[PDB]
Design an enzyme around this catalytic site. Structure first.
Site, PDB file in Angstrom:
ATOM      1  N   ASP A 193       0.853  -0.935   0.337  1.00  0.00           N
ATOM      2  CA  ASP A 193      -0.045  -0.373   0.164  1.00  0.00           C
ATOM      3  C   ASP A 193       0.402   1.367   0.207  1.00  0.00           C
ATOM      4  OD1 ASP A 193      -1.809   2.319   0.614  1.00  0.00           O
ATOM      5  OD2 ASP A 193      -2.743   1.573   2.310  1.00  0.00           O
ATOM      6  N   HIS A 349       7.557   3.608   5.962  1.00  0.00           N
ATOM      7  CA  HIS A 349       8.546   3.723   4.908  1.00  0.00           C
ATOM      8  C   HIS A 349       9.167   4.826   3.879  1.00  0.00           C
ATOM      9  CE1 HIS A 349       4.955   0.813   2.236  1.00  0.00           C
ATOM     10  NE2 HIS A 349       4.299   1.532   3.240  1.00  0.00           N
ATOM     11  N   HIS A 383       7.573  -2.274   3.698  1.00  0.00           N
ATOM     12  CA  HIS A 383       7.348  -3.776   4.139  1.00  0.00           C
ATOM     13  C   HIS A 383       8.233  -4.665   3.128  1.00  0.00           C
ATOM     14  CE1 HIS A 383       3.248  -3.502   6.449  1.00  0.00           C
ATOM     15  NE2 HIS A 383       3.187  -2.893   5.256  1.00  0.00           N
ATOM     16  N   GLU A 408       3.901  -9.265  -0.896  1.00  0.00           N
ATOM     17  CA  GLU A 408       2.600  -8.688  -0.230  1.00  0.00           C
ATOM     18  C   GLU A 408       2.319  -8.825  -1.666  1.00  0.00           C
ATOM     19  OE1 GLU A 408       1.532  -5.237   2.010  1.00  0.00           O
ATOM     20  OE2 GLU A 408      -0.024  -4.990   1.595  1.00  0.00           O
ATOM     21  N   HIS A 410      -1.147  -8.702  -1.664  1.00  0.00           N
ATOM     22  CA  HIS A 410      -2.496  -8.002  -1.083  1.00  0.00           C
ATOM     23  C   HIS A 410      -3.618  -8.649  -2.453  1.00  0.00           C
ATOM     24  CE1 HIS A 410      -3.967  -5.485   2.445  1.00  0.00           C
ATOM     25  NE2 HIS A 410      -5.382  -6.971   1.956  1.00  0.00           N
ATOM     26  N   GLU A 453       1.035  -9.039   4.180  1.00  0.00           N
ATOM     27  CA  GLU A 453      -0.876  -9.461   3.927  1.00  0.00           C
ATOM     28  C   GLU A 453      -0.201 -10.189   2.823  1.00  0.00           C
ATOM     29  OE1 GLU A 453      -1.778  -5.127   4.104  1.00  0.00           O
ATOM     30  OE2 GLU A 453      -2.622  -5.405   5.572  1.00  0.00           O
ATOM     31  N   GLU A 529       0.861  -3.792  12.857  1.00  0.00           N
ATOM     32  CA  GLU A 529       0.032  -2.458  13.110  1.00  0.00           C
ATOM     33  C   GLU A 529      -0.821  -2.022  14.242  1.00  0.00           C
ATOM     34  OE1 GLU A 529       1.075  -3.340   8.065  1.00  0.00           O
ATOM     35  OE2 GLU A 529      -0.657  -1.837   8.602  1.00  0.00           O
ATOM     36  N   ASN A 589      -7.008   4.199  -8.264  1.00  0.00           N
ATOM     37  CA  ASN A 589      -6.165   5.012  -7.383  1.00  0.00           C
ATOM     38  C   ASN A 589      -7.691   4.686  -5.602  1.00  0.00           C
ATOM     39  OD1 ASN A 589      -7.354   7.986  -5.778  1.00  0.00           O
ATOM     40  ND2 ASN A 589      -7.594   7.907  -8.725  1.00  0.00           N
ATOM     41  N   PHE A 593      -6.075   7.998   0.999  1.00  0.00           N
ATOM     42  CA  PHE A 593      -5.342   6.391   2.528  1.00  0.00           C
ATOM     43  C   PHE A 593      -3.595   5.952   2.060  1.00  0.00           C
ATOM     44  CE2 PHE A 593      -5.889   1.863   3.488  1.00  0.00           C
ATOM     45  CZ  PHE A 593      -6.812   1.929   4.061  1.00  0.00           C
ATOM     46  N   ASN A 596      -1.226   8.505   5.862  1.00  0.00           N
ATOM     47  CA  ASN A 596      -1.443   7.642   7.800  1.00  0.00           C
ATOM     48  C   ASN A 596      -0.799   7.952   8.635  1.00  0.00           C
ATOM     49  OD1 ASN A 596      -1.794   5.017   5.105  1.00  0.00           O
ATOM     50  ND2 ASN A 596      -2.995   6.792   5.622  1.00  0.00           N
TER      51      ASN A 596
HETATM   52  O1  LIG Z   1      -2.700  -3.488   7.065  1.00  0.00           O
HETATM   53  C1  LIG Z   1      -2.047  -2.109   5.929  1.00  0.00           C
HETATM   54  O2  LIG Z   1      -2.917  -1.070   7.120  1.00  0.00           O
HETATM   55  C2  LIG Z   1      -2.233  -0.212   6.096  1.00  0.00           C
HETATM   56  C3  LIG Z   1      -3.397   0.929   5.955  1.00  0.00           C
HETATM   57  O3  LIG Z   1      -2.886   2.568   5.094  1.00  0.00           O
HETATM   58  C4  LIG Z   1      -1.483  -0.151   5.140  1.00  0.00           C
HETATM   59  O4  LIG Z   1      -2.662  -0.204   4.186  1.00  0.00           O
HETATM   60  C5  LIG Z   1      -0.450  -1.620   5.103  1.00  0.00           C
HETATM   61  O5  LIG Z   1       0.573  -1.269   4.709  1.00  0.00           O
HETATM   62  C6  LIG Z   1      -0.930  -2.931   5.553  1.00  0.00           C
HETATM   63  O6  LIG Z   1      -0.473  -3.799   6.211  1.00  0.00           O
HETATM   64 MG   LIG Z   2      -1.957  -4.242   1.935  1.00  0.00          MG
HETATM   65 NA    NA Z   3      -2.007   3.836   3.657  1.00  0.00          NA
END
Ligand SMILES: O=C1O[C@H](CO)[C@H](O)[C@H](O)[C@H]1O
Ligand SMILES: [Mg+2]
Ligand code: NA
Ligand SMILES: [Mg+2]
Ligand SMILES: [Mg+2]
Ligand code: NA
Ligand code: NA
Ligand code: NA
Ligand code: NA
Ligand code: NA
Lengths: 1015, 211, 174
Positions: A193, A349, A383, A408, A410, A453, A529, A589, A593, A596
């Site tokens: 992400d 990140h 990640h 990842e 996801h 993920e 997280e 997109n 998001f 964060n």
């Molecule tokens: O679960 C998650 O939540 C976050 C949302 O911002 C972000 O996507 C992280 O990479 C992911 O592991």
């Molecule tokens: Mg993800």
């Molecule tokens: Na995010």
């Protein structure tokens, strides 16, 4: 063969002719240079200007480019991401792959970056030994040519790819050609992400090693029960011709002092029926009373590994920083050096708003300094493996690191489709194994992670066991498939709540307290997280920290996340602004998001950072009578750079203060007896504030750094003295449309059709631009919005519940508006109903009492329908005519605070410029609230009571309608929102309702009172 | 892995089968040089994973084996766990690296003797009776190879069987082996004869050791 | 590119275009035939006589062999080990590798067996469905061509290598 084989659509080919992975090398030819970590002449940087050309597909690259420069190509800085140079768009997508899901295939239109460099190679480099090239990061796959001839191929964007150029180079001038593909089969394992970018984004270098060389070395440190004795064990591997005269010496240094040394010829122990490793040697050094490494005190030694002849001629030396520490899980607790850790972590990140995913030393250091200054002791490499310097800085500054494999998946359905498939095991294995081979000597790495993920598949179990076998010194964790699978030593959920269960099928997120004690469960729990810090967030942060401190096996977590992934764009005037998903024509997109963080992209803190700092404090406090009890939460260090300052103030007015040095052993207590405080005759609340100050600068902080604080209410003297009786009486004037009240140079006007105070005059100057009206709504926070959109409504999101109920559309209907003349006052009584499609949502009943002293007392009693969604706020708002420079208040501050995020804030007298009362969240929302306020001053106005407020040049309406902070315009005058009550902001996650029941406005009936007067 | 018909016949006639991955690196120095090298993990993984994918439905297969004489490397541990995860219905065994490593559910030595210890460095072959009761040891013991039946041999075979019957956790073994690997050659008269190593000009060779 | 890549000297390439492994299949189109384990019309044996030529190295194989039968080639029973037909010698070595230990490289002098077969398929197989070839055992590695066109590559002498031939087959002789 290159265009014919298409190795970028084959998960069975992750490289061609790539050299083995290994710890950081420099091939020093002088041991003293190796010891001091000075630059090596054998390690050359190719971080200069390269030649670059962009193509829509590899089939569009002309054959001429292999031999000579393209004139159409440009000159660009390397390392770089090419999206940051404008060649194509960076794409922000969260889960959905940026390419059609059809493994192993990628789009035929595959943006191709053609990099080239012309450079000098000295003859001495080619006469003897081996010359290799090192690409620390190429996103996402590449072919390499040297002087027209094909060298090799590499995948995995986040680990170095190394190739031998010995046979390819000539003396004088040489030319490298790199074809970088944006998409490959490797992209299927790179669905993090984050912004999707490409290019040669980490360092490029040339390394000269001798033919007879150190090819690998591993450092282990083992301890006795009380850590008073250690054995450093160093396994060293050589390449080249084995000879009886060859030796390895491993020496260990503390500063300029050599503490231990071992020398041996090659030839390992017998291992099986066929003998041992003739090309390996293990050195064992005894270390008495080692200085131990931790995030608290990052004690380091230097290990120099010398390859030499028996007679003492050096062939080459390699080296590393050594931190003596033991990481183990015992009886369900993660222990560092025998003590249970409390992880004050954050995910980080690699992001820069100007340079994209290119990291620099200055930004890394900036991040580490801010982290430690805000009481963080740990970082998760979300990640992927990081830029090599990161681990060096974490070693030296002292942070615990979770090193995470670049895996990842996801966007797959189900999430484990690739990770349970043995055909994808080779590609996965290299992302795990080559990480371990690179980073295993860094003391800061305490935990390995298998990625993020990617569900839970058989490939994870295999790679979990591989790490356990090759490196028993570090626990292995992985969250995928429900956070407590057979592929993890630590229960490591994401966004599991403190008390609330979330019983999703197959992958429930239990309450963290409950999870620990599930039948048969014994592992420690550390959230990979938690506390999603998106926009106005970190509501309920204190709840986690209370649980962490109470429960031994709750050993903390990593906040999501450190820094907003916003990118700088420029307007028509060349002025910079912060951009998010969709601002580059990227589609589909995921909009805001990507933002964060606890800090903005330029590392300016969000208000939430101070809440994190306070909750992650290392000193805990209790008050009993005159005694302050200080408890240390340090595991290893004494408080040898700490003083406690205390201050007692009566409603912001200082009465007494003092300071006492802290002398607290790790985990110890200190009792501090406050002197006798003189009882003030004056009315009000006494407040005690304590703060821990660091008198000396450290490597990570300045002199006078505040590391901890706490506040208590002391004695309160309630006011019983009646205000002086006024000799004046306010006069009421009535028309069909207005009730008007006059007293001296002051006038109040109540509109009889609306039932609101529409205007106020001081010396015939208007004070309002918009009438004083009830407000029950807020410009929705990112937490109110969740994943709702116009295309696909999420009916459960708070904003959608408010919208559907008509909260934003509801119009005030007047029920009553009366005026009465009293003995020394005029009394205005009002009643309003807010209705939507026949349904009464709210009723507001007010009295306004204007007396002869000029004070207007406002009493508000609100009814909220039990079946309407609980409102965002219960308060009043108006647009004042005045724009003043300062805002002065007695209440919680100085920073923005909300009901579920106000523990960091302190009660005192605060005075800030107006601009500080607005928080410039990139996505605009309700912001800048201050809670627990008893007095507010702005220009000539004073409001008294017990309220929450925000104050700014932007209306809730404008904040609600504007998607970017740079598009906001200051409105005429000042918008004031004064709330009797305000809903929590939440943030346990930002995609489902997360405001805890105790912070929802569900009481049905609400009462508050305000006094408005002239200061 | 055998010809697919073999498993069908073992299912139907009734024999217990140890299905074994096509991995042997005996000639490496040391024996685990490739199997401890992650660069060889992909090639090794396919030999294990594709065997399981093919044969997992055969009732006759009761035990998976990771191969033969390839030392003990980290690749074995990874693949051990892979099998344990995908197919919990069968124990996994592997003899390499001392016959009792973390990559085996069964103590499975080759040519460990009944009463006599052979205390080789790193990879001892303990008396089978002694092996069972080593401090901490709890696993069953089944010899993957014993009683080397080369020429005039099987002296002391009865000693194994007495021990197997007396000791619950000594659960037998697999004789080495079924059939002489002799090949037919013809003399000047066209008469057939049994040939071994070296009889085809093959050099170097290990002579009659194939029988 | 087959000769240029030398996939047989690369432990990172153990196959190219090989299908996923699976339990024994016969693709019955009748449930009763499946129940009784009787022969399946959808599973055809190619255990017949093939054309074979021995070469001392892959570099010695003429390009014409891809397109048409070599007249010097012999007709041999398949399945077979070519040492058992006398083309070269079987080697008996115990521990010591039959080749110089220098991973991943093998001798440049690398005995090469060129097998070929001319065959036809059911017309209905060309119109619909998927036709795969299954080699249950090839020692030790091999490339596959169908009608002059390269299909794939396989390693591991002791498990089946399977390849999709659907897009390679034609009406008449293949
Ligand atoms: O679960 C998650 O939540 C976050 C949302 O911002 C972000 O996507 C992280 O990479 C992911 O592991
Ligand atoms: Mg993800
Ligand atoms: Na995010
Ligand atoms: Mg590939
Ligand atoms: Mg190969
Ligand atoms: Na705890
Ligand atoms: Na101190
Ligand atoms: Na907005
Ligand atoms: Na027994
Ligand atoms: Na033999």
């Amino acid at each position: 063969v290159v265009l014919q084989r298409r190795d970028w659509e084959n998960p069975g080919v992750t490289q061609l002719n790539r050299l083995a992975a290994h710890p950081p090398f420099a091939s020093w030819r002088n041991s003293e240079e190796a010891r001091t970590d000075r630059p090596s002449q054998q390690l050359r940087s190719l971080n200069g200007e390269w030649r670059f050309a962009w193509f829509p597909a590899p089939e569009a690259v002309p054959e001429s480019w292999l031999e000579c420069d393209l004139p159409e190509a440009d000159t660009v800085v390397v390392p770089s991401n090419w999206q940051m140079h404008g060649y194509d768009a960076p794409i922000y997508t969260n889960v959905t792959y940026p390419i059609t899901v059809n493994p192993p295939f990628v789009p035929t239109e595959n943006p191709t970056g053609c990099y080239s460099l012309t450079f000098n190679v000295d003859e001495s480099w080619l006469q003897e030994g081996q010359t290799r090239i090192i690409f620390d990061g190429v996103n996402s796959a590449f072919h390499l040519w040297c002087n027209g001839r094909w060298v090799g191929y590499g995948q995995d964007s986040r680990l170095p790819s190394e190739f031998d150029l010995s046979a390819f180079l000539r003396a004088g001038e040489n030319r490298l050609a790199v074809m970088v593909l944006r998409w490959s089969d490797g992209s299927y394992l790179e669905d993090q992400d984050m912004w999707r970018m490409s290019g040669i984004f980490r360092d490029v270098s040339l390394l000269h090693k001798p033919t007879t060389q150190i090819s690998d070395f591993h450092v282990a440190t083992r301890f006795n029960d009380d850590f008073s004795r250690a054995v450093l064990e160093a396994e060293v591997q050589m390449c080249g011709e084995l000879r009886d005269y060859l030796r390895v010496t491993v020496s260990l240094w503390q500063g300029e002092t050599q503490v231990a040394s071992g020398t041996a010829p090659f030839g390992g122990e017998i291992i099986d029926e066929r003998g041992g490793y003739a090309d390996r040697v293990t050195l064992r050094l005894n270390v008495e009373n080692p200085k131990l490494w931790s995030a608290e005190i990052p004690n380091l030694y230097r290990a120099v590994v010398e390859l030499h002849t028996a007679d003492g001629t050096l062939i080459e030396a390699e080296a590393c920083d050594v931190g003596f520490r033991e990481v183990r899980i015992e009886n369900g607790l993660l222990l560092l050096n025998g003590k249970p850790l409390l992880i004050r972590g954050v995910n980080r990140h690699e992001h820069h708003p100007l340079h994209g995913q290119v990291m620099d030393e200055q930004t890394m250091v900036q991040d580490i300094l801010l982290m430690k200054q805000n009481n963080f002791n740990a970082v998760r490499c979300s990640h992927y493996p990081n830029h090599p310097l990161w681990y060096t800085l974490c070693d030296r500054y002292g942070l615990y690191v979770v090193d995470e494999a670049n895996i990842e998946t996801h966007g797959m359905v189900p999430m484990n489709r690739l990770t349970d498939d043995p055909r994808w095991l080779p590609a996965m294995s290299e992302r795990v194994t080559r990480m371990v081979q690179r980073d295993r000597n860094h003391p800061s790495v305490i935990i390995w992670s298998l990625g993020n993920e990617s569900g839970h598949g058989a490939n994870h179990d295999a790679l979990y066991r591989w790490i356990k076998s090759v490196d028993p010194s570090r626990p292995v964790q992985y969250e995928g498939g429900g956070a407590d699978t057979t592929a993890t030593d630590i229960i490591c959920p994401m966004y599991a709540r403190v008390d609330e269960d979330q019983p999703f099928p197959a992958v429930p997120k239990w309450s963290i307290k409950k999870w620990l004690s599930l039948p048969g469960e014994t592992r420690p729990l550390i959230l990979c997280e938690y506390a999603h810090a998106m926009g106005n967030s970190l509501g309920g942060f204190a709840k986690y920290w209370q649980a962490f401190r109470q429960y031994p096996r709750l050993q903390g977590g990593f906040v999501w996340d450190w820094v907003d992934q916003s990118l700088i764009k420029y307007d028509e005037n060349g002025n910079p602004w912060s951009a998010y998903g969709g601002d580059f024509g990227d589609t589909p997109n995921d909009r805001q998001f990507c933002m964060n963080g606890l800090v903005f992209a330029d590392r300016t803190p969000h208000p939430a950072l101070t809440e994190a700092k306070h909750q992650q404090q290392f000193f805990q406090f209790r008050l009993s009578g005159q005694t302050i009890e200080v408890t240390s939460e340090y595991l290893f260090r004494h408080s040898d750079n700490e003083l406690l300052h205390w201050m007692v103030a009566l409603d912001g007015k200082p009465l007494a203060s003092g300071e006492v040095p802290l002398d607290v052993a790790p985990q110890g207590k200190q009792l501090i007896e406050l002197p006798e405080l003189p009882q003030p005759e004056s009315a009000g609340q006494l407040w005690l504030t304590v703060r821990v100050v660091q008198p000396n600068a450290t490597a990570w902080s300045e002199a006078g750094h505040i590391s901890a604080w706490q506040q208590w209410r002391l004695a309160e003297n309630l006011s019983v003295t009646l205000p002086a009786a006024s000799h004046a009486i306010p006069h009421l004037t009535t028309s069909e449309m207005d009730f008007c009240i006059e007293l001296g140079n002051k006038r109040w006007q109540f509109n009889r059709q609306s039932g609101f105070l529409s205007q106020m005059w001081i010396g015939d100057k208007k004070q309002l631009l918009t009438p004083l009206r009830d407000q029950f709504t807020r410009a929705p926070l990112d937490n109110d919005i969740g994943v709702t959109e116009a295309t696909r409504i999420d009916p459960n999101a708070w904003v959608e519940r408010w919208k559907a109920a008509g909260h934003y559309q509801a119009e005030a209907a007047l029920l009553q508006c009366t005026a009465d003349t009293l003995a020394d006052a005029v009394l205005i009584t009002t009643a309003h109903a807010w209705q939507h499609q026949g349904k009464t949502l709210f009723i507001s009943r007010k009295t306004y009492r204007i007396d002869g002293s000029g004070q207007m007392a406002i009493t508000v009693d609100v009814e909220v329908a039990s079946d309407t969604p609980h409102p965002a706020r219960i308060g009043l708002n108006c647009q004042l005519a005045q724009v003043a420079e300062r805002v002065n208040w007695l209440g919680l501050g100085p920073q923005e605070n909300y009901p579920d995020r106000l523990t960091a804030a302190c009660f005192d007298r605060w005075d800030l410029p107006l601009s500080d009362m607005y928080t410039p969240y990139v996505f605009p929302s309700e912001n800048g609230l201050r809670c627990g306020t008893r007095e507010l001053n702005y220009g000539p106005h004073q409001w008294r009571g017990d309220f929450q407020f925000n104050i700014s040049r932007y209306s809730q309406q404008q904040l609600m309608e504007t998607s970017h902070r740079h598009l906001l315009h200051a409105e005429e005058g000042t918008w004031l929102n004064i709330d009797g009550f305000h809903m929590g902001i939440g943030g346990d996650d930002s995609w489902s309702p997360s405001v805890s029941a105790e912070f929802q406005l569900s009481a049905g009936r609400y009462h508050y009172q305000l006094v408005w007067c002239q200061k």
